[PDB]
Amino acid sequence: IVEGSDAEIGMSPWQVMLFRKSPQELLCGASLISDRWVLTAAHCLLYPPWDKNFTENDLLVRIGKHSRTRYERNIEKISMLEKIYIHPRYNWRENLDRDIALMKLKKPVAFSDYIHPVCLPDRETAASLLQAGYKGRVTGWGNLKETWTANVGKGQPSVLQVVNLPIVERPVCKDSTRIRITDNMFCAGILGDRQDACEGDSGGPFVMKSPFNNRWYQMGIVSWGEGCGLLHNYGFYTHVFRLKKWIQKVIDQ
Amino acid sequence: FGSGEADCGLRPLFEKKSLEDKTERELLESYIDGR
Numbered sequence: 637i638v639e640g641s642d643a644e645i646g647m648s649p650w651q652v653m654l655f656r657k658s659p660q661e662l663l664c665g666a667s668l669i670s671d672r673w674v675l676t677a678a679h680c681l682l683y684p685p686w687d688k689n690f691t692e693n694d695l696l697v698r699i700g701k702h703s704r705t706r707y708e709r710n711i712e713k714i715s716m717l718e719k720i721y722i723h724p725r726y727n728w729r730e731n732l733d734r735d736i737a738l739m740k741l742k743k744p745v746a747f748s749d750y751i752h753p754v755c756l757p758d759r760e761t762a763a764s765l766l767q768a769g770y771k772g773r774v775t776g777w778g779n780l781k782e783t784w785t786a787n788v789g790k791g792q793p794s795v796l797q798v799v800n801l802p803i804v805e806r807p808v809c810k811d812s813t814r815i816r817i818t819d820n821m822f823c824a825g826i827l828g829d830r831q832d833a834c835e836g837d838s839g840g841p842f843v844m845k846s847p848f849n850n851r852w853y854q855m856g857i858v859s860w861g862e863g864c865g866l867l868h869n870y871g872f873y874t875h876v877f878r879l880k881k882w883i884q885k886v887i888d889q
Numbered sequence: 890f891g892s893g894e895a896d897c898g899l900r901p902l903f904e905k906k907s908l909e910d911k912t913e914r915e916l917l918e919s920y921i922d923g924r
């Protein structure tokens with residue numbers, strides 16, 4: 637996250653860290669949507685142009701975390717994966733359309749002060765909250781400083797970072813990039829501002845707090861950017877409500 | 890789905906304790922001033 641700030645303890649208790657076994661590295665962010673199910677970007681699991689194609693055995697999710705590196709004894713829980721579900725029409729070749737993936741935990745996780753699931757939007761919540769100018773919140777352990785030639789950024793945080801960003805009008809998103817954007821994406825950010833989510837933040841949640849019931853709703857997933865923290869553009873997010881029928885399909889089956 | 894749905898989105902250390910975090914006000918302000 638560029639130009640964010642340190643998360644408070646328990647500020648984002650749905651934040652999941654996708655973690656690679658061997659070698660041990662942070663891969664991506666993700667989100668906890670129930671005691672059993674974790675949501676992330678498809679491109680965190682599968683991206684041929686980078687030799688990325690992970691089995692369930694390659695990864696482990698870490699939940700309840702705050703520090704990027706410290707083992708948080710009796711707070712963080714480490715879960716292994718039963719099954720990965722990648723959207724079958726995920727479009728990595730062109731624009732990352734339908735950049736969504738589910739992971740089923742082998743074993744349900746226990747909720748605590750530090751671990752709690754985020755809500756998924758229904759239609760009304762999405763119609764109300766997902767509007768240009770409204771702000772959501774992104775969190776992650778991705779890099780801290782702007783990069784031009786890649787979305788990675790530079791400088792690793794010691795603690796989970798947070799930034800609030802406004803949703804941008806669809807025509808503006810479209811004019812800001814040569815890449816074909818779809819209804820399954822939206823963009824967020826302030827022109828002239830560096831606040832941004834970087835590659836290491838990918839797969840993590842874009843969340844909004846409902847003014848009606850005080851619940852937090854995941855509206856997006858950090859999907860892609862051109863550079864990180866640049867002054868002239870915006871970041872792109874998977875539109876979670878628009879893919880909700882696929883999510884429900886996977887979960888029910 | 891498993892447990893979590895009814896109680897989703899309410900944070901043990903914030904909403905459940907009637908405590909607000911340091912920047913959630915900015916989110917609410919954007920609903921009123923952002924359009």
Ligand SMILES: *[C@@H]1O[C@H](CO)[C@@H](O)[C@H](O)[C@H]1NC(C)=O
Pocket residue numbers: 682684689
């Ligand atoms: C990913 O896993 C293996 C390749 O090593 C194979 O089962 C599958 O076809 C691969 N898929 C992609 C997208 O490369």
